[PDB]
Amino acid sequence: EEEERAFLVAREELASALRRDSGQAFSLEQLRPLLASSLPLAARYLQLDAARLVRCNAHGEPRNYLNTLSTALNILEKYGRNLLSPQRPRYWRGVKFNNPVFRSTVDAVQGGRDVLRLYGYTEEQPDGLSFPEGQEEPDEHQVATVTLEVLLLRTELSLLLQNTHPRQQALEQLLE
Amino acid sequence: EEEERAFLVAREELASALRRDSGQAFSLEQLRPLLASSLPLAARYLQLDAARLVRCNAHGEPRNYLNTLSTALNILEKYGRNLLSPQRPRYWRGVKFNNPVFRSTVDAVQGGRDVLRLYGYTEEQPDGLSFPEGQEEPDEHQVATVTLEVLLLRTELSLLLQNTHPRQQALEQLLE
Amino acid sequence: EEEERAFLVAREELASALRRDSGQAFSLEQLRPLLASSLPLAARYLQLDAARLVRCNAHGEPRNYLNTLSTALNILEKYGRNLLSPQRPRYWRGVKFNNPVFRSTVDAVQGGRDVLRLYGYTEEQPDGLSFPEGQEEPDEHQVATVTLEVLLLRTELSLLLQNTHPRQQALEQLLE
Ligand SMILES: Cc1c(Cl)cccc1Nc1ccccc1C(=O)O
Ligand SMILES: Cc1c(Cl)cccc1Nc1ccccc1C(=O)O
Ligand SMILES: Cc1c(Cl)cccc1Nc1ccccc1C(=O)O
Numbered sequence A, B, C: 001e002e003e004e005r006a007f008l009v010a011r012e013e014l015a016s017a018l019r020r021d022s023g024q025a026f027s028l029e030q031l032r033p034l035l036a037s038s039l040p041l042a043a044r045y046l047q048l049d050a051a052r053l054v055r056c057n058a059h060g061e062p063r064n065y066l067n068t069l070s071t072a073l074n075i076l077e078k079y080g081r082n083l084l085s086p087q088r089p090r091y092w093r094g095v096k097f098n099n100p101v102f103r104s105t106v107d108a109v110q111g112g113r114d115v116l117r118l119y120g121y122t123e124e125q126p127d128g129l130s131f132p133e134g135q136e137e138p139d140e141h142q143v144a145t146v147t148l149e150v151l152l153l154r155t156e157l158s159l160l161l162q163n164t165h166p167r168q169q170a171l172e173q174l175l176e
Helices: A002-020 A028-035 A050-055 A062-083 A100-104 A112-119 A140-161 A168-172 B002-020 B028-035 B050-055 B062-084 B100-104 B112-119 B140-161 B168-172 C003-020 C028-035 C050-055 C062-084 C100-104 C112-119 C140-161 C168-172
Strands: A094-096 A123-125 A128-130 B094-096 B123-125 B128-130 C094-096 C123-125 C128-130
Touching: A002 A028, A002 A140, A028 A140, A050 A140, A062 A112, A062 A140, A112 A128, A112 A140, A140 A168, B002 B028, B002 B062, B002 B140, B028 B140, B050 B140, B062 B112, B062 B140, B062 C062, B062 C100, B100 C062, B112 B128, B112 B140, B140 B168, C003 C028, C003 C062, C003 C140, C028 C140, C050 C062, C050 C140, C062 C112, C062 C140, C112 C128, C112 C140, C140 C168
Parallel strands: none
Antiparallel strands: A094 A128, A123 A128, B094 B128, B123 B128, C094 C128, C123 C128
C-alpha cells in the first residue's frame, strides 16, 4: 500500500527519465527508493526474471558469479539504452550471438538471451534474435521499464559485491 | 551420427513399452543404451529442460539437492504414467498446487510446474494447471516421450547419489 | 525399564560429543544403542516432535515422503551443528524463509520451522525466524539435545529407506 504505491512512482519516474535521456547516469541517491525497499522480489521486478537470473547462475563463489551476472546485465543495460536513444544504432533491429562482447558476457549467463526478448527481440534466428520485421519502432515504455529493472538488478549486485547494499545483511542470507 | 541413431531407436522402444504398459518397471539393463550414452545433454533430453532443472536448483550440498530433484522427478514420472494407464485417474485432467504430495515435491524445485505443461497441463488457473477443456484424450506420444525423459533424469540423479553412474566421475566434476 | 538409563548414557555421550566437536560424524555402530532401542517414541525423543514430523507429512508413497523428511532433517541437523561450532557462522542469529536451501527442504515439511524454534529461533518476522536480541549465545545444552534428536530421526528414516533399520519390519507395519 504505502511502500507499494510509492515504489511504482519512483519506478515510473526513473523510467520516464530514461526515455528523456537514455544516456543519463543515475547516482546511488536517485536509486535509493528502489534499492532500500523491502518489497518482495516479484513486486520490485515485474518484467525482469530476477529470480531465475540469480538462481540459475549461482554456481561457485558469490564474488565470482555476482560479477558474471552484473557484467552481463551491464551489457543488457546498454542494449536497452540504445533503443531509447535519439540516434539509434544502425543494426538496432537484431543482435547476433557471435558478437564477442555478447558471447563473453550475456551468453555466459543462463537466461541472458531471454532479457533481449523483453526488449522486443522476439524473433529467433539460428545465430541471433531480432525484432519482428513488421515492427517499425520499439515500444519505448516497454523498453524503458525493462532497462530500469536491468539497471536496478545490476546496481543491487554491484552494491552487494561492494558491501554497501542497504539490505546487505538480508540479501547475503539468501546466498549462504 | 551413429550414436544418434542408436539413441533414437532405444528411446522409441522404451516409449512404446511405456504406452504398452505404463506401470512396468525398467531395470538399469533396459536403460543402459540411454544411460551409458555419450551424446551431449541437449541431444538426450529433447523436451525436458534438464539443464534448468539442475542448474536452477543446485543450491547447497549435492547430496541434498540431488535428492530434492530426484523425488520431484519421481512424482512427475507417476503423473505421466497415470496419463498412459488404461484405468486413468478420475482427475487426470488437472493438477492442484495445494495437493500435499505436489506441494512438498514438485513445487519444491524451480521448473517443476513446467514439466506438467509438457504433459499437456497448459491451462493455468490460480489453483493449478489443467488440460484444455476441448482435449478429449492426452497426447500419448508426447506423454510417453516426456515420461521417458523424466525417468531417465531421475535415474541419472539416483545413480549419482548411489555412486553407480556409468560416467560418475565425469558428472561429479560438473558439480565442483 | 532400565533401557532408558542406557539410552540416557548414550544420549549424553553423543550430546557431549556434539559440543566438543560439532563437525565429527557418528558411525552406525555408535548410534546402534539408540537405533535398536525398544523404548517408545515419546521416551526416545524428548524435544523433537517426531510423531508430528512423520504423521503430518506422511502423504503419498513412503519412499517419497521419508526422503523429503530425511532431507529436511539433514538441513536442520546442519543448523544445530553450526550453532555449536567454535567458528560460528556470522548470520547464526537468524534464518530467512527465502533461503533457497531452506525453502526447498525445511519449508517443504510441516513442522520444520518448529525445529528451528527448539534451537532458539523463537522470534518470528515476515522474513524468517531469529534469536532474541538479548541472547548473546545460544543454549549449548539445549541445541545439542535437539541436534542429536534430529540426527537420530534422520538416521532412522535413512536406514528405513535402505532396508537396514534394526526394527525395519516393526516400523514398516506403521506405514502400511
Ligand atoms: C536481489 C538479490 C540479489 Cl541482488 C542477490 C541475491 C539475492 C537476491 N534476491 C532474491 C533472488 C532470487 C530469488 C529470491 C530473492 C529474494 O529477494 O527473495
Ligand atoms: C545429467 C546431470 C546430472 Cl544427473 C547431474 C548433474 C549434471 C548433469 N548434467 C548437466 C545438467 C545441466 C546442464 C548441463 C549438463 C551437462 O552435463 O552438460
Ligand atoms: C520412528 C519412526 C520412523 Cl523413523 C518412521 C516411521 C514411523 C516411526 N514411528 C512413529 C512415528 C510417528 C508417531 C509414532 C511412531 C511410533 O513408533 O509409535
